[PDB]
Amino acid sequence: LIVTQTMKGLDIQKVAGTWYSLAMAASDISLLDAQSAPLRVYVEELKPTPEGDLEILLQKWENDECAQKKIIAEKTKIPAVFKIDALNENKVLVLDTDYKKYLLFCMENSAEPEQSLVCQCLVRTPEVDDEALEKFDKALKALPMHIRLSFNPTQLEEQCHI
Numbered sequence: 001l002i003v004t005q006t007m008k009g010l011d012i013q014k015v016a017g018t019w020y021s022l023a024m025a026a027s028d029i030s031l032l033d034a035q036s037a038p039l040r041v042y043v044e045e046l047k048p049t050p051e052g053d054l055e056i057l058l059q060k061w062e063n064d065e066c067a068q069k070k071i072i073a074e075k076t077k078i079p080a081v082f083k084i085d086a087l088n089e090n091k092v093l094v095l096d097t098d099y100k101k102y103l104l105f106c107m108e109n110s111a112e113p114e115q116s117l118v119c120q121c122l123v124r125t126p127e128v129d130d131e132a133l134e135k136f137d138k139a140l141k142a143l144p145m146h147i148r149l150s151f152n153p154t155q156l157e158e159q160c161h162i
């Protein structure tokens with residue numbers, strides 16, 4: 001109930017494949033600040049599953065290392081919102097993609113918006129897409145984002161973005 005966009009027409013099985021965490025943004029700063037901040041996470045691939053769910057694969061800096069985590073995201077009635085497991089009843093919100101170049105999704109927590117919402121601009125290939133960043137950047141004024149991070153193709157090709 002803060003993210004007012006969500007895409008009508010989501011063919012999930014078309015989001016499959018790899019992506020790079022190019023850009024990402026959040027509501028308060030403590031959440032992404034340092035490499036080891038909680039929602040500092042790097043999406044590496046989308047396996048849409050047969051049930052219609054989506055397995056998410058992502059690296060994250062924690063105990064000194066770049067650590068994989070598998071996150072599975074369960075269907076809901078809305079095609080574009082999926083519920084994730086961990087520490088509250090969750091949403092992954094998919095905002096916009098063309099399937100083939102970029103993909104915009106946020107990640108909130110129904111218990112605590114202005115403190116949980118984190119958003120990401122994903123891309124299919126390790127290069128900056130201005131127009132994706134365009135579309136990312138223009139979708140988060142309706143949102144109270146307070147930190148923005150951008151990464152460059154080299155950091156995209158490395159573990160945990162350096």
Ligand SMILES: CCN(CC)CCC[C@H](C)Nc1ccnc2cc(Cl)ccc12
Binds near residue numbers: 038039084087117118
């Ligand atoms: C905004 C997402 N939402 C739950 C998925 C926030 C509630 C807290 C739980 C720990 N969220 C998480 C679920 C799964 N992995 C996580 C890795 C990190 Cl650093 C932080 C939160 C995570």
